[PDB]
Amino acid sequence: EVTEVSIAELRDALESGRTTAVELVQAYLARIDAYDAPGTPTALNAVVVRNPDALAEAQASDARRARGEPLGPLDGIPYTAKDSYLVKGLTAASGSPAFKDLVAQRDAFTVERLRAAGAICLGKTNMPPMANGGMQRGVYGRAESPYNAAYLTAPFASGSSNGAGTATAASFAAFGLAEETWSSGRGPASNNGLCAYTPSRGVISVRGNWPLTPTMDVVVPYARSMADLLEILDVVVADDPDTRGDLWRMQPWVPIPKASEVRPASYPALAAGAEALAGKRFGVPRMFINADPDAGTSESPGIGGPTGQRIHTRPSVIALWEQARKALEAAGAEVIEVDFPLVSNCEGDRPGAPTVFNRGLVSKEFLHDELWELSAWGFDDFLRANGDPKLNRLADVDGPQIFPHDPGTLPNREGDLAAGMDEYVRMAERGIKPWDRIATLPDGLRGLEETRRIDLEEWMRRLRLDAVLFPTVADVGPADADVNPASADIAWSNGVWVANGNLAIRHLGVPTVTVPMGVMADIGMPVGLTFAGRAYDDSALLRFAAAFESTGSRRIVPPRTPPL
Amino acid sequence: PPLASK
């Protein structure tokens, strides 16, 4: 039985003969065929592309082990990867019809590390087209929640790793791989009671990952426990000699430390009990716990959509935060209610607060380049680097098919995305400039880091804060949010459409660690607790999250996917 | 909700 089993217990069974790599692959496939495939009562639709060589790779794992030569701690451990990941031999559509026949000619760096370690990819998980959204249906549709069919498995507007969240929580594999541009990593993890880690810039190479916004894309591993997440990072986190596609590891204007310089000697050693929280100071933004009436009191708040508006947290989510704060205080930690200039100075939600568009730290022309010229190059250079003879140029892509609207669903609120994605093909036909010749890049990248220094780094120092904590999301949107107007208003509200922090978290290179905060008593939906801190302080944040996880049993098995 | 700052 593999339901809610840890990597250590699986490796333990592999070394004792109680199971084999092949038998683990078959155990997970039985749960996929019983809960994930179409025609089943649940039909969660998380695993959308199968790896036909999973059994062949599993047989090779048992052959290496029978010979007393395991490749390492993850030899024979199944996992899933977001459809944005390049997995050699399999398609890489990014959930988009226009790329449905694109074949990965090689692996992504995270997949290359796992394959060399003997880990076997069972398949790829669902996502909206190009990760440009959350719960919108792509070429493979969308994934459903294993905790409550009446609610989404991820934020509707930014939660593109919805398949990775559902699959990991339902034990369709030992762990999962996700990706985040806004909240596509923290979002799905929150609704499924998962542990997630968004690293600082350049810690995990994004080479071989379908980009969305090269300045913000990061690799996000999923795990049902902090122990499992540390098992994963111990293998994937390593220096990558090939920097192609990774903008932050290519640019020379801003210094970025090597991954081998940021990572600890042993990630599993970062685990600790409640002692790691004694004498620590943690700040919780009032805006994420229904304690900031000043949010949204400016003349024209926000920078588009529901940004810059007051967040109404669900009462059942407040009750879990109250018990989470009590656990922190009982462990000797100090929780302080504070402002959050990182969000307020980005969205201009109160009088005097500037926005990223008018503050002057980054030019307006860079923000234009950041989402048009720079992203079009990201799409084009990814196709050129992969090198599929059938499709290796963005100019040769069916534009209108990159993100076609789902007929019968409510129109997108941010704006039209069918013609918006086709525009990137128009730019590729007129000529795309590469990353290193975009004039606004040197000032923009230095301005992004400076923004974090003022709003977060120096801010945390003068407040003597060790980390910043807050509920990952304020509420969950109903599953019918795509067709029900009443549900759309809930799902598209601030704090719900996107995990707390909106774009400023990923825009400024802020590391985060998310852990389950508990399950809502009313609707039985999990909600997470996010730990954020200074850049490249990742080891401390991972330790804090592991310490908080040890003080409670805040994860349950999804009721829709019981053990077979 | 997904691309850069818009």
Dihedrals phi, psi of A74, to nearest 5 degrees: -100, 10
Rounded CA-CA distance A54/A76 in Å is: 10
SS3 (DSSP) at A121: strand
* CA dist A405 → A246, A306, A354, A421 (Å): 30, 21, 34, 11
Per the listing, tokens 């290193």 go with: A436
Contact A72, A235 (CB under 8 A): yes
Q: Which token pair is A329?
A: 């205080």
Cβ contacts of residue A159 below 8 Å, gap of 6+? A134, A135, A152, A153, A165, A183, A184, A187, A188, A191, A499
- How determined? X-ray
Interface contact flag, A158 B1, Cβ < 8 Å: yes
From the list A131, A357, A370, the residue facing B2 with the nearest CB is: A131
* CA dist A372 → A73, A379, A400, A536 (Å): 42, 11, 17, 29
* Residues pairing with A219 in the sheet: A179
Rounded CA-CA distance A546/A23 in Å is: 31
Order of strands, sheet of A218-223, starting from the edge strand that comes earlier in the sequence: A47-50, A120-125, A78-82, A175-180, A218-223, A195-198, A512-519, A526-532, A467-471, A281-285, A334-338
Dihedrals phi, psi of A386, to nearest 5 degrees: -60, -50
Tell me which long-range contacts A310-314 makes (C-beta under 8 A, separation of at least 24).
A310/A494, A311/A287, A311/A474, A311/A494, A311/A495, A311/A500, A312/A474, A312/A475, A312/A493, A312/A495, A313/A288, A313/A289, A313/A471, A313/A474, A313/A475, A313/A495, A314/A474, A314/A475, A314/A476, A314/A520
Min Cα–Cα distance to chain B from A503, Å: 7
DSSP H helices in A355-417: 364-371, 373-386
Residue ranges of chain A whose CB lies within 8 Å of a chain B CB = 131-134, 157-158, 160, 181-182, 184, 212-213, 215-216, 303-305, 356-357, 367, 370-371, 374-375, 414, 497-498, 503, 507
Interface contact flag, B3 A497, Cβ < 8 Å: no
Q: CB-hemisphere CA count at 13 Å for A350?
A: 13
Q: Which token pair is A407?
A: 């007929």
Rounded CA-CA distance A357/B5 in Å is: 9
Q: Which token pair is A362?
A: 């980054």
Q: Residue A167 is inside which H or E element, if any?
A: helix A162-169
Dihedrals phi, psi of A506, to nearest 5 degrees: -80, -25
Residue A85 is given by DSSP the state: B
Helix axes A373-386, A364-371, angle to 10 degrees: 30
Residue A334 burial by Cβ neighbours in a 10 Å radius (0-12, 13-18, 19+)? middle
Q: Is A266 a catalytic residue?
A: no
State the Cα angle at A372 between A370 and A374, rounded to 5°. 55
Cβ contacts of residue A553 below 8 Å, gap of 6+? none
Contact A418, A405 (CB under 8 A): yes
Which residue on chain B is closest to A376 by alpha carbon?
B3
DSSP string across A210-245: --S-TTT-EEEEEESSHHHHHHHHHHH----S--TT
Q: Which residues of A touch B2 (CB under 8 A)?
A: 131-133, 157-158, 160, 181-182, 184, 212-213
Rounded CA-CA distance A177/A190 in Å is: 15
Q: Which token pair is A1?
A: 């039985």
Dihedrals phi, psi of A442, to nearest 5 degrees: -60, -45
Rounded CA-CA distance A159/A189 in Å is: 9
Catalytic residue among A84, A94, A96, A160: A160
Q: Which token pair is A69?
A: 């030569």
SS3 (DSSP) at A57: helix
Which residue on chain A is closest to B2 by alpha carbon?
A132
Interface contact flag, B1 A356, Cβ < 8 Å: no
Contact A233, A263 (CB under 8 A): yes
Contact A535, A452 (CB under 8 A): yes
From the list A131, A414, A507, the residue facing B5 with the nearest CB is: A507
Residue A103 is given by DSSP the state: B
Rounded CA-CA distance A324/A322 in Å is: 5
* Residues pairing with A176 in the sheet: A80, A222
State the Cα angle at A458 between A452 and A464, rounded to 5°. 125
Q: CB-hemisphere CA count at 13 Å for A339?
A: 14
Resolution (A): 2.3
Within 10 angstroms of residue A154's Cβ, the number of other Cβ atoms is: 35
Min Cα–Cα distance to chain B from A451, Å: 14
State the Cα angle at A450 between A543 and A243, rounded to 5°. 70
Q: Which residues of A touch B4 (CB under 8 A)?
A: 213, 215-216, 367, 370-371, 374-375, 503, 507
Rounded CA-CA distance A92/A101 in Å is: 8
Per the listing, tokens 């640019």 go with: A251
Interface contact flag, B5 A131, Cβ < 8 Å: no
Residue A358 is given by DSSP the state: T
* CA dist A219 → A176, A363, A430 (Å): 11, 27, 31
State the Cα angle at A81 between A76 and A85, rounded to 5°. 125
Q: Is A82 a catalytic residue?
A: yes
| A107 marked as binding residue | no
Cβ contacts of residue A193 below 8 Å, gap of 6+? A147, A169, A224, A516, A519, A526, A528, A554, A555, A556
Residue A359 is given by DSSP the state: S
SS3 (DSSP) at A328: helix
Residue A454 burial by Cβ neighbours in a 10 Å radius (0-12, 13-18, 19+)? middle
Residue A544 is given by DSSP the state: H
Q: Which of A107, A95, A191, A103 lies closest to A152, judged by CA?
A: A191
SS3 (DSSP) at A98: helix
Interface contact flag, B5 A371, Cβ < 8 Å: yes
Interface contact flag, B2 A132, Cβ < 8 Å: yes
Q: Report helix, strand and coil shares of chain A as percent, to nearest 5.
A: 40, 15, 50
DSSP string across A449-492: HHHHIIIIIHHHHHHT-SEEEEES-S---BGGGGT-HHHHHHHT
SS3 (DSSP) at A423: helix
Min Cα–Cα distance to chain B from A412, Å: 10
CATH topology for A7-272+520-550 is: Amidase signature (AS) enzymes (3.90.1300)
How far does chain A reach from its first CA to its final CA, in angstroms? 8
How far does chain B reach from its first CA to its final CA, in angstroms? 7
Q: Is A184 a catalytic residue?
A: yes
Rounded CA-CA distance A281/A546 in Å is: 16
Helix axes A315-330, A538-550, angle to 10 degrees: 100
Cβ contacts of residue A207 below 8 Å, gap of 6+? A108, A109, A240, A242, A243, A244, A245, A246, A385
Catalytic residue among A184, A205, A344, A493: A184
Q: Which residues of B touch A158 (CB under 8 A)?
A: 1-2
